[PDB]
């Protein structure tokens, strides 16, 4: 089965309040395992999963240093972006970075990531070839040309193919007890009175892992969505996830509606009724 290592890094400028906020979090699949928070009591790379408390000081010391390096460069980037777009020095802006790797069941690189955002919009992204860049605007075109000339792609690729994949395999060994699990969703349909003409059927999905799931309602074998309400997947808090989808249906014909659940842990997909 495939696995992913991902880091989500956020910098938020706040002039008149002080230095920019900087936070990095790491994930293995849908499981967080590390964090760095500039606003914490003692800012450092620290474990966020019990199986990471194994690693010694040489891990966290080196990780903390790398984070603080990026913190400084994220500060410059924020300033540079403000210059690029001719924005006011007084306003608060965001700079985001996501990177990591996807590996296949054969323990090899499937896809590497190195992409950036300004104020929640795409800025620049390392393409799937890990050689070329996609720039979202003409400002990012300036960045792209600078990073092309600097040879950044080969530098990132070196990490993505080597360091990223190897340490991911290490994490999958450290947390082999919990990370390699696959909890199929326990699903059901709930009845809730609405009007005197119709009723609400809420299809539930509980306690599943990973978080990737598919929930749909189909009437008489066809399909329905444009009326369907679908909340985004939510963490239960115990490492599992929840999700539901509801439909408004007239009285008496509830059993002509089928909820369909697709998930990694379900060999045969689920078909449910009230």
């Amino acid at each position: 089965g495939p696995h992913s290592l991902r880091y989500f890094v956020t910098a938020v400028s706040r002039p008149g309040l002080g230095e920019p906020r900087f936070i990095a979090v790491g994930y293995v699949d849908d499981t967080q395992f590390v964090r760095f928070d500039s606003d914490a009591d003692n800012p450092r790379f620290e474990p966020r999963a019990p199986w990471m408390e194994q690693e010694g000081p040489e891990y966290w010391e080196e990780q903390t240093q790398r984070a603080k390096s990026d913190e400084q460069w994220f500060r410059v980037s924020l300033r540079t972006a403000q210059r690029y777009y001719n924005q006011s020095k007084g306003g608060s802006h965001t700079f985001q970075r996501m990177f990591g790797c996807d590996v296949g069941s054969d323990w090899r690189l499937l896809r590497g990531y190195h992409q950036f955002a300004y104020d929640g919009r795409d800025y620049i992204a390392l393409n799937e070839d890990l050689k070329t860049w996609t720039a979202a605007d003409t400002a990012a075109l300036i960045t792209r040309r600078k990073w092309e000339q600097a040879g950044d792609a080969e530098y990132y690729r070196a990490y993505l193919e080597g360091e990223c994949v190897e340490w991911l395999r290490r994490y999958l060994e450290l947390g082999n007890e919990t990370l390699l699990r696959t909890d199929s969703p326990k699903a059901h349909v709930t009845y809730h009175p609405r009007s005197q003409v119709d009723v609400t059927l809420r299809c539930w999905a509980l306690g599943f892992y990973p978080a990737d799931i598919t929930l749909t309602w189909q009437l008489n074998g066809e399909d329905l969505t444009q009326d369907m309400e679908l909340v985004e997947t939510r963490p239960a808090g115990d490492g599992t996830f929840q999700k539901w989808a509801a439909v408004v249906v007239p009285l008496g014909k509830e059993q002509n509606y089928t909820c369909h659940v697709h998930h990694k842990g379900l060999p045969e997909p689920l078909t449910l009724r009230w």
Binding site: Y7, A24, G26, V34, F45, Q63, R66, A67, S69, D70, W73, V76, S77, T80, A81, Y84, R97, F99, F116, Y123, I124, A140, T143, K146, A150, D152, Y155, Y156, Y159, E163, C164, W167
Partner: peptide, 9 residues
């Protein structure tokens, strides 16, 4: 493992 960016945008 965390990896750094080498410079600004």
């Amino acid at each position: 493992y965390y990896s750094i960016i080498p410079h600004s945008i």
